[PDB]
């Protein structure tokens, strides 16, 4: 019953080739709901889930203004950081920002986040107390002194404990028919002879939501991880996820093996046997 909202911003400098690329995406749980791209034609925050389309023009105008202002901050900050590090103007660099909040089953605030990277490594992060910062290096110490002077933590905390939680609650109610529903995995087994002496068994989980799942293999009832393979959970493209697990077995011995599937949408864990 706990839920999250997250925004992910990325800015990439393009020396010699114009202003930086800026992309913003928002998620509730595992569901993307909004996007912005500096290189798209609309110049507007855009909907990516059905339940956000109901928001009125003032919502879209404000969201657009906010991400455009961050894109301009990031442009400036790419130059500022280049200067802190004494880097060449010829190189492409990246700023990434994540922020958002977690609520419990009663809708109450659990915690907030604001963390920033430069070139794919930690730069500065708001600590869990929402009242202090961790700087990863001497350049980020400059930014930390600037943000301490500016009372930036108080600004972040006011959003994270306030607006962030209130809008996440709103989205969970408006989007309840999908955000608060589980889609259990559709499961099956396939079999793939390698030679006369060995075969692969593959246990599939398809079409599930949310992304969290466990697939395990057993031999005569005992967990087996030797000679198994688990692929990274992958998006289907339609808002659901996929995963499989495979084991190589001696030919003739397939029926010794079982796969177990655990997911929040299952009334009971599933067992599959060839």
């Amino acid at each position: 019953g706990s839920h999250s909202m997250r925004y992910f911003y990325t800015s990439v400098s393009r020396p010699g080739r114009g202003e930086p690329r800026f992309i913003a995406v928002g998620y509730v749980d595992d569901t993307q709901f909004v996007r912005f791209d500096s290189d798209a034609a609309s110049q507007r925050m855009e909907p990516r889930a059905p339940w956000i389309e109901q928001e009125g023009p003032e919502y879209w105008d404000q969201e657009t203004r906010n991400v455009k202002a961050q894109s301009q901050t990031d442009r400036v900050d790419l130059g500022t950081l280049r200067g802190y590090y004494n880097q060449s103007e010829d190189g492409s660099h990246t700023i990434q920002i994540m922020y958002g909040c977690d609520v419990g089953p009663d809708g109450r605030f659990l915690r907030g986040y604001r963390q920033d990277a430069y070139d794919g490594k930690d730069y500065i992060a708001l600590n869990e107390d929402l009242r202090s910062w961790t700087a990863a290096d001497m350049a980020a110490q400059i930014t930390k002194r600037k943000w301490e002077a500016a009372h930036a933590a108080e600004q972040q905390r006011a959003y994270l404990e306030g607006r962030c939680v209130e809008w996440l609650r709103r989205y969970l109610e408006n989007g309840k028919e999908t955000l608060q529903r589980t889609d259990p995995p559709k499961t099956h087994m396939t079999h793939h002879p390698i030679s006369d002496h060995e075969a692969t068994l593959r246990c599939w989980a398809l079409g599930f939501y949310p992304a969290e799942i466990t697939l395990t293999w057993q031999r005569d009832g005992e967990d087996q991880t030797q000679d198994t393979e688990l692929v990274e959970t992958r998006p289907a493209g339609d808002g659901t996820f996929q995963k499989w697990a495979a084991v190589v077995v001696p030919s003739g011995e397939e029926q010794r093996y079982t796969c177990h599937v655990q997911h929040e949408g299952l009334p009971k864990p599933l067992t599959l046997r060839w």
Partner: peptide, 9 residues
């Protein structure tokens, strides 16, 4: 909904 403040570094 996004945060309104943008923090320069």
């Amino acid at each position: 909904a996004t945060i309104g403040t943008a923090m320069y570094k």
